[PDB]
């Protein structure tokens, strides 16, 4: 399924080239511009664990998740991955635990040492 495909066929978008964050562009976005550090970004997402369980979705909340890019307000894989996206893009992102919640996990939904899968849609970005 989609997690296996990004695992086996995704692009390594880490600067270290350690394959800790893998990406496939699923829906091509607009033009060439990507957000800059500090921009307010608006995203919809769904996340799954490697046991197949859906652990969260912003779609189910009827409002986007909003954060300031490149500030550590999200797991590392998201700062890295969202920075590569165009407006309107949908991607799949595979996040090894060193770019996610590590050995600690996040109680109650994320176990220790968890590889995470996301589908992410970049709705908009703006400077403040
Ligand atoms: C509703 O969750 C919003 C947010 C959570 N976080 C950060 C901000 C975070 C904040 C606090 C504790 C754990 N993680 C994150 O960095 C990442 C990436 C952005 C989207 C979400 N997550 S997440 O991985 O989907 C996530 C993680 C744990 C969790 N527990 C209940 S819903 C949920 C969603």
């Amino acid at each position: 399924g989609a997690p296996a495909t990004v695992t086996e066929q995704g692009e390594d978008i880490t600067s270290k080239k350690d394959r800790g964050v893998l990406k496939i562009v699923k829906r091509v976005g607009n033009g060439e511009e990507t957000p800059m550090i500090g921009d307010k970004v608006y995203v919809h997402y769904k996340g799954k664990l490697s046991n197949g369980k859906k652990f969260d979705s912003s779609h189910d909340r009827n409002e986007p998740f909003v954060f300031s890019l490149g500030k550590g307000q999200v797991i590392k894989a998201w700062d890295i991955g969202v920075a590569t996206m165009k407006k309107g893009e949908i991607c799949h992102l595979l996040c090894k635990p060193e770019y996610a919640y590590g050995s600690a996990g996040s109680l109650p939904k994320i176990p220790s040492n968890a590889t995470l899968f996301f589908e992410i849609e970049l709705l908009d970005f703006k400077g403040e």
Side-chain angles (χ1 to χ4, degrees), residues 1-127:
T5 296
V6 62
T7 300
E8 296 170 344
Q9 315 293 333
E11 173 188 335
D12 184 357
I13 63 165
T14 66
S15 63
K16 284 191 268 187
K17 302 291 170 57
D18 64 13
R19 292 178 61 96
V21 186
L22 301 173
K23 182 185 179 197
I24 294 174
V25 176
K26 296 293 292 179
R27 209 275 282 284
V28 175
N30 299 338
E32 294 178 15
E33 193 177 11
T34 61
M36 68 170 292
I37 182 171
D39 280 352
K40 188 177 184 173
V41 297
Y42 296 71
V43 305
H44 268 305
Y45 69 96
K46 57 184 180 192
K48 300 203 291 188
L49 300 182
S50 59
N51 68 7
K53 287 281 177 276
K54 158 170 95 186
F55 65 85
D56 200 34
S57 166
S58 60
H59 300 273
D60 295 342
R61 294 185 294 260
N62 301 120
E63 56 173 66
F65 181 74
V66 182
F67 69 104
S68 300
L69 185 65
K71 301 296 171 175
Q73 295 185 356
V74 291
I75 55 169
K76 290 172 175 174
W78 270 54
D79 270 339
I80 294 163
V82 174
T84 72
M85 295 182 73
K86 282 80 168 183
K87 185 168 167 174
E89 180 177 317
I90 302 172
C91 79
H92 288 175
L93 196 71
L94 190 78
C95 309
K96 300 305 290 179
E98 296 79 11
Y99 293 87
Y101 295 97
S103 50
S106 175
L107 231 60
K109 304 235 169 157
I110 312 300
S112 185
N113 304 330
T115 293
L116 307 182
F117 172 87
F118 295 91
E119 179 170 288
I120 300 173
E121 179 179 359
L122 180 58
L123 302 162
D124 198 16
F125 60 90
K126 63 189 186 170

